[PDB]
Amino acid sequence: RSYPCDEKKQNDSVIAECSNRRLQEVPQTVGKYVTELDLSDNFITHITNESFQGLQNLTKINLNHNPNVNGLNITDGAFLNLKNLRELLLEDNQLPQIPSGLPESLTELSLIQNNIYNITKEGISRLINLKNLYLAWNCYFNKVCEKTNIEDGVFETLTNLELLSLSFNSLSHVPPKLPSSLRKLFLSNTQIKYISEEDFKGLINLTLLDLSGNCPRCFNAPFPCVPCDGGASINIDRFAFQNLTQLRYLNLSSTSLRKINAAWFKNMPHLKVLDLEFNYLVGEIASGAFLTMLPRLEILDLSFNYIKGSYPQHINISRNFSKLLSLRALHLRGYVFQELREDDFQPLMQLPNLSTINLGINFIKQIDFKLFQNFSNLEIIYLSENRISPLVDPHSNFYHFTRPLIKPQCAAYGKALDLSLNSIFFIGPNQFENLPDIACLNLSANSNAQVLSGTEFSAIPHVKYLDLTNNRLDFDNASALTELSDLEVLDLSYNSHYFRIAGVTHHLEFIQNFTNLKVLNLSHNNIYTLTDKYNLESKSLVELVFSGNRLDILWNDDDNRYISIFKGLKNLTRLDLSLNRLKHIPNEAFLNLPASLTELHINDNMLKFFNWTLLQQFPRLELLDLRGNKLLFLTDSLSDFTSSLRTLLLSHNRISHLPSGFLSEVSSLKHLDLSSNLLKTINKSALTKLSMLELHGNPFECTCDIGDFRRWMDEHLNVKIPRLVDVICASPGDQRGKSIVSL
Amino acid sequence: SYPCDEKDSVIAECSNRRLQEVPQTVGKYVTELDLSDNFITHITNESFQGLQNLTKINLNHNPGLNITDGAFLNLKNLRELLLEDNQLPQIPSGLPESLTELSLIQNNIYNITKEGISRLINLKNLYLAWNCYFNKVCEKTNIEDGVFETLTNLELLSLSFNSLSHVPPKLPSSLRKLFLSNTQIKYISEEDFKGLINLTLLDLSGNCPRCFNAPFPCVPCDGGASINIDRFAFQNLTQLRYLNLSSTSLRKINAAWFKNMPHLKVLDLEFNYLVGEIASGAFLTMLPRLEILDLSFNYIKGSYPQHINISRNFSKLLSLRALHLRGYVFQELREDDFQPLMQLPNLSTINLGINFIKQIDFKLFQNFSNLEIIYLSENRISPLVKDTFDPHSNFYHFTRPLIKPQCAAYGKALDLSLNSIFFIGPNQFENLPDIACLNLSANSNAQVLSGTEFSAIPHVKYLDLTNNRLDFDNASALTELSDLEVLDLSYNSHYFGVTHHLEFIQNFTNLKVLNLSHNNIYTLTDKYNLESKSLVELVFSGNRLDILWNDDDNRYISIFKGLKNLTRLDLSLNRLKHIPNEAFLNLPASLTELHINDNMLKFFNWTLLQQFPRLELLDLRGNKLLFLTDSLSDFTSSLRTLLLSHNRISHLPSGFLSEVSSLKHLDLSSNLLKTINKSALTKLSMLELHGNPFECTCDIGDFRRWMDEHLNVKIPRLVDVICASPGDQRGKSIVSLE
Ligand SMILES: *[C@@H]1O[C@H](CO)[C@@H](O[C@@H]2O[C@H](CO)[C@@H](O[C@@H]3O[C@H](CO[C@H]4O[C@H](CO)[C@@H](O)[C@H](O)[C@@H]4O)[C@@H](O)[C@H](O[C@H]4O[C@H](CO)[C@@H](O)[C@H](O)[C@@H]4O)[C@@H]3O)[C@H](O)[C@H]2NC(C)=O)[C@H](O)[C@H]1NC(C)=O
Ligand SMILES: *[C@@H]1O[C@H](CO)[C@@H](O[C@@H]2O[C@H](CO)[C@@H](O[C@@H]3O[C@H](CO)[C@@H](O)[C@H](O[C@H]4O[C@H](CO)[C@@H](O)[C@H](O)[C@@H]4O)[C@@H]3O)[C@H](O)[C@H]2NC(C)=O)[C@H](O)[C@H]1NC(C)=O
Ligand SMILES: *[C@@H]1O[C@H](CO)[C@@H](O[C@@H]2O[C@H](CO)[C@@H](O[C@@H]3O[C@H](CO[C@H]4O[C@H](CO)[C@@H](O)[C@H](O)[C@@H]4O)[C@@H](O)[C@H](O)[C@@H]3O)[C@H](O)[C@H]2NC(C)=O)[C@H](O)[C@H]1NC(C)=O
Ligand SMILES: *[C@@H]1O[C@H](CO)[C@@H](O[C@@H]2O[C@H](CO)[C@@H](O[C@@H]3O[C@H](CO[C@H]4O[C@H](CO)[C@@H](O)[C@H](O)[C@@H]4O)[C@@H](O)[C@H](O)[C@@H]3O)[C@H](O)[C@H]2NC(C)=O)[C@H](O)[C@H]1NC(C)=O
Ligand SMILES: *[C@@H]1O[C@H](CO)[C@@H](O[C@@H]2O[C@H](CO)[C@@H](O)[C@H](O)[C@H]2NC(C)=O)[C@H](O)[C@H]1NC(C)=O
Ligand SMILES: *[C@@H]1O[C@H](CO)[C@@H](O[C@@H]2O[C@H](CO)[C@@H](O)[C@H](O)[C@H]2NC(C)=O)[C@H](O)[C@H]1NC(C)=O
Ligand SMILES: Cc1cc(-c2ccnc3cc(Cl)ccc23)ccc1O
Ligand SMILES: Cc1cc(-c2ccnc3cc(Cl)ccc23)ccc1O
Ligand SMILES: *[C@@H]1O[C@H](CO)[C@@H](O)[C@H](O)[C@H]1NC(C)=O
Ligand SMILES: *[C@@H]1O[C@H](CO)[C@@H](O)[C@H](O)[C@H]1NC(C)=O
Ligand SMILES: *[C@@H]1O[C@H](CO)[C@@H](O)[C@H](O)[C@H]1NC(C)=O
Ligand SMILES: *[C@@H]1O[C@H](CO)[C@@H](O)[C@H](O)[C@H]1NC(C)=O
């Protein structure tokens, strides 16, 4: 049972996770099998060559973010002793120089987020084995350095280096004498404004070059941002990329480009991905000679090139876009225009493999929707934040938004259409005319107040994942959404009436009509009364999310009206009743929770009482989540009540005592969470296939009655007890603040 | 006193004290007993023995309630009895004839018997709303023939939210205000409102309602049928000021209805079907004295027409003060469409909210000589780039001011919140009247403020830009509005770790109030101070002072140091663990009021308050403070209001109150006191101790006596000043012991 680290198997070797653990030195209590040690995000101040003796087998050390709340003192030669150290991470250590005397065995080295202004032969030219060197965020609006000093030739002895990052450093010019072995060179945000024919000569293996953020489009710029003198673009020579025949990824985002020279791409037959955002390329997009040089481009990003001051009627697409045969995905966010006609997109209609058109953030008023019918492979039409009306971390892509445009779970069903954040205030009769067969539709946040009658989706009848969240939809009618007989996922989260005065009544009869509806999300609808029918009914449904509603009212109704709301959900396995303000649940109401349940969530309510006997009604229940409540006690024999429960979550409650023979002999129960409660000790009498037990944030009384518990922690090494550091003695005050393991 | 808080009359507040019976510990004086929101179950005639000079009793919201025969009869000076939310089956028998106002709202009273109320001849104001509705039970409210005709001094009768089906016969001529909203009447005969010549207000709303997209359950009349109202219904109603026909599903309005009614002042037609009537509008000629007209939410379902068709007969509305046209829904507003309103000499509010209007020929608001309030929220104006629940509430009318008073007070106010102005167009404000108060809130507006955008309306004094994505890192930003006094930039952030440059503030000659809450400000470029000689209030909540002041090179020790006229600073929600001692001392010594609440403060240097000689109010709530001096007097003598709610203070000196003198309000609620010392015990007027784990034996009784000794020092919420230890005591009020 490791301390303070969490050791464990990783593939075919053993790993010590020792982070966010307030340590002030390296531990010497580390397992002897460990080959990779993460000590990051801690209060460690000094490293000497003593700090990692008896761990010669180490391969990977991470000392990132040390310390938290001067710098990190690394005594020269501190690691030379580690003959198998391949990867060494030293980010955010406030270093003032590359550590002296680093071990030749290294292959990956990160020195990001330091105050290293000097790249010497003294520091790195001895590491002939480096593949991956990362030096970014080292001189970035640091008043000293005025400029990064790159000792000449420092890099040429690195004859096996494949990755060099120097982004967010003031370099003014490209370092000379870079090794032939490079495949990826990152020079983003380096105030490199001119690029010569010499700069990238002898890099015949380059697959990636990043020159983004030089001559920034510093307008609309979140961060500190010095645009070049005038409005000037980065200046890239005519033959700058001539010997770069392997280039696959080129990023020229935010280089203020107005024109694009087609000659840059004459010897680049494999360019796969080209980022051109935050530039001024509206003219170029209309003509675009360079589009003829890119038959293999798979991703083009031209987002946010809009002209300041302008909201022009139409977009203008070069016919040359048709010369983009390999194109998978086009990103045109924030060009900004009013009307999209069938004709404007003719070039793209032939491109065989085009699956993503991203047209977010253009404030487009009208789209001639029939155009999308002419694409044999659209999977993702993304029109968020437009104005359609009704019809009648330094390791992150800094400039191109990387997360999925549309949730996987939605997109997975088929064609995806995202009309979130438009002006669709009611669903017009012609709203979805001429649309291809949409499987996944997003109307979220349209101030949309439709009274659903079963006729509004008929033109796209096969939607399977509908997201309607954050509108004002009236689904009082029991015919509502029935025209979509294949619907599998409906999200009504955050739907209210166009007033948010309380008191709104709901009719939920439409639910029963669906024959393969699987997941329904009624969260935050502030549901306190159902009118006429008082039960939910569906043979299909599997998941119901009832969070953020007033079950509290519903279930204390004088007349027992809703004692059976969720019983007629006959196949349900997952029910979330969190955030419903519950103090006490009517024993009758709980016994009508449908017995098909596997996962019940009642967390974040105000329960003082929970009747454990009722879990006999639930022979297939595996996960009970009761966190964030006020409960005071537990049954003294849980095994009696259920023998199917695997996971029980009691963190953030008021429980002070663990009953005798409680854990004995539930057996069923693998994971039990008791953290953040009021336990002071754990009795000899309370002392199973339990494989994890959470106890952090409980005020303990060490010493001495606690000793029982300890020898239990030693004879049961199988019972993993996470987060030991945060299992803290409350008292006596001489122990206070210690782990209960310190003794 | 206990348990009532008691203060030409005398009011005992016994609201919300979890009382289970009418206290007998009630000062004989008391003429107003408020017992609402409690656990009271029975009211016998024992309950108000020797409380014989009571004027008013509230018993609302208890807890149904078992009130005995003639239980209130004893009380000869009782005028006002409120009995709302008491689950009563029937009106109480034996109510005192002295009553002048009764309320029986939210009960189960399905029968209006003479037995119950006909002997209450001094009644002036009767309320029986919300009793029979949405329940089986009763099928209909049984109202005894002639029950009201003996209440000849009755002025207001409210039966709203009951099922009546027809208006009650035999109503007393003295009625001035009859309320019949949501009562299920669908026809109004000539005879129903007969002889009621003193009526100033009639409410018939929710009768044949416009149900579809109504919040609460709602039932349109069979078919699409409106309420049917005889031609003459209102013939002998010449005195009416208020007519409420909201949600009556009206298509056609009979101008004859208003022949005899030349003083109607407020007409409400929200939630009807009157797009046709707004167009023709014969009834509009019968309203010379009308001041507030409301045609809101009459949109035709399906439709989103180009234009709004406004009858010329709108110009026969010479007394109109405020017109409400929300939810009409139309794409474009032409200058020509609002001609009829341009000669109305006293029109000051046009309300066009929630119409989804794409365009507005703005120059049209120049031909109106009294417009103070143009409210255009939730429309779709775009950047311009070209030259030329509670019973007693109003269900259908938006009661609250359309624009914050503080803004409108400066003059002509334009609200364009929740529109589509993503950047400020070059001609955005051309052809506007001289505008003092502007709301541009919630427009996804990403404009780069360069000091030229606002020049067409340069006399703006109040400007609201909250919930946008503005860039004001240029020092010229907004400086074209030299008369600017209030500027709100709360919840502005970059669209996607953003620098801020806050030099623009300094340029303003006359800027009173700057709000930058929730701007996640962690760094300032170039200049590290904020400078101004005008600014009186800065709000800096929801920013990252914690970063700026844990700054390794001390660049921000004097951020606010230069706001020389500052009296109110708000550093709430700044995640401040610690304040650097000197940085604290560099807060404008002009301060009257300092808020450092809802941070994470473990220590607070109580000495640095000698430096703040004007300080009246200090707010430290919701932190982690472990202790306090002990000698507050030494450190300041101006402090009137100290707020310590929600800290970890376990000791209370003991040199506190001996002597601070200056202090009028000390708030120690939700701390960790176990007791108040004997050494711990000259004027102060409110003390807040509830929420502490008090140790209830056998001291402190000294505090118990010190409460008796010092009666002046009001302590609120006694009932929640709770013994944590030891059960027995656990859960009792410290005033109960011996
Ligand atoms: C309305 O309510 C619905 C239904 O609850 C919500 O939609 C669900 O949202 C949840 C989370 O909010 C989703 O659950 C997550 O699915 C992710 C995708 O999993 C894929 O890969 C995994 C692993 O390889 C497979 O098991 C899986 O089948 C998928 O192939 C997971 O990445 C998430 O992981 C969770 O656990 C891990 C630990 O294992 C943690 O790191 C995470 O924190 C996390 O909890 C998770 O399981 C679910 O997929 C959604 N379903 C649907 C149908 O959309 C909506 O969010 C809600 N609406 C609103 C407005 O809130
Ligand atoms: C200019 O464009 C180029 C692309 O042409 C772009 O380069 C990309 O940089 C990102 C960010 O560094 C890389 O993505 C990472 O790849 C590394 C190695 O595979 C991973 O370590 C990263 O994963 C970490 O972070 C992830 C979340 O971001 C986590 O999932 C995970 O836990 C990791 O901790 C991440 O996957 C990417 O490899 C390159 N692209 C290529 C082809 O090499 C560059 O960023 C752009 N420049 C700027 C300033 O935007
Ligand atoms: C139909 O339209 C009618 C036209 O207004 C609505 O009648 C109004 O109903 C509301 C809700 O109950 C009443 O609100 C009450 O007003 C009185 C006011 O008393 C005085 O004191 C205040 C103090 O400042 C002052 O502002 C006023 O001018 C008064 O002189 C209060 O006792 C209540 O707290 C509450 O504010 C309106 O008073 C009433 N108007 C009139 C003229 O009687 C009616 O609500 C509409 N129907 C529906 C269903 O909404
Ligand atoms: C950004 O910061 C602004 C400045 O703090 C916020 O504006 C202030 O908002 C508060 C409420 O948060 C207002 O204070 C209230 O005003 C009312 C009005 O009282 C009336 O009667 C009193 C009698 O003394 C008179 O003095 C007033 O002038 C009014 O006639 C009070 O009744 C309340 O109790 C309370 O004091 C401020 O007035 C208001 N200031 C301004 C300039 O508007 C603003 O809300 C913040 N913005 C955001 C988005 O959070
Ligand atoms: C529908 O569109 C909305 C609006 O963009 C998406 O909501 C975002 O969801 C992501 C990931 O779930 C959140 O981190 C953001 O907070 C949301 N943004 C906003 C503005 O609310 C939503 O995910 C979309 N639905 C689907 C199925 O993809
Ligand atoms: C500008 O318009 C916004 C949007 O309507 C107003 O925001 C409201 O502010 C009040 C009180 O501060 C809140 O109770 C409401 O919830 C807000 N509404 C919304 C939709 O956010 C704001 O009051 C307006 N500003 C001025 C100066 O009048
Ligand atoms: C992507 C995007 C672009 C713009 C925008 C469009 C046109 N002209 C501008 C001028 C200025 Cl000074 C600032 C922004 C704009 C506004 C909002 C937005 O979300
Ligand atoms: C004022 C307002 C009006 C509308 C609206 C307009 C036109 N036709 C409709 C048809 C239906 Cl079923 C529902 C709503 C409408 C929607 C939202 C809103 O706030
Ligand atoms: C399109 O995708 C297929 C499947 O991967 C690929 O084999 C094909 O070569 C691609 N077509 C073009 C024109 O690049
Ligand atoms: C219920 O859904 C579960 C999936 O959770 C599935 O295994 C079972 O077949 C379904 N049965 C019915 C009748 O829907
Ligand atoms: C707990 O449930 C059992 C039925 O399993 C019932 O007899 C008992 O009344 C319940 N306990 C409480 C306190 O309601
Ligand atoms: C400072 O504020 C006070 C108090 O409102 C005001 O009287 C004075 O005129 C202000 N100073 C300036 C320079 O405007």
Curated annotation (Swiss-Prot), chain B:
Changing D471A: Abolishes activation of NF-kappa-B. Its main location: membrane. Coiled coil: none annotated. Changing V329A: Increases activation of NF-kappa-B. Residues 692-738 form the LRRCT domain. Changing G497V: In IMD98; increased NF-kappa-B activation measured in a reporter assay; results in increased TLR8 protein degradation. GO terms for cellular component: endolysosome membrane; endoplasmic reticulum membrane; endosome membrane; external side of plasma membrane; Golgi membrane; plasma membrane. Glycans are attached at residues 45, 53, 66, 111, 198, 236, 244, 309, 313, 346, 367, 439, 474, 507, 515, 565, 605, 677. The chain holds residues 33 to 818 of 1041 of the full protein. This is Toll-like receptor 8. LRR repeats lie at residues 77-98, 99-119, 122-144, 153-174, 175-195, 198-219, 239-260, 263-285, 289-311, 319-340, 346-367, 370-388, 410-431, 434-455, 459-479, 483-502, 510-531, 534-555, 565-586, 590-610, 614-635, 638-659, 662-681. Expressed in myeloid dendritic cells, monocytes, and monocyte-derived dendritic cells. Keywords: Disease variant, Disulfide bond, Endosome, Glycoprotein, Immunity, Inflammatory response, Innate immunity, Leucine-rich repeat, Membrane, Receptor, Repeat, Signal, Transmembrane, Transmembrane helix, Ubl conjugation. One of its GO terms (biological process) is toll-like receptor signaling pathway. It is found in: Endosome membrane. The gene is TLR8. Changing G497D: In IMD98; gain-of-function variant resulting in increased NF-kappa-B activation measured in a reporter assay. Activated by RNAs having enough uridines. It comes from Homo sapiens. Homodimer. Interacts with MYD88 via their respective TIR domains. Interacts with UNC93B1. Interacts with BTK. Interacts with SMPDL3B. Belongs to the Toll-like receptor family.
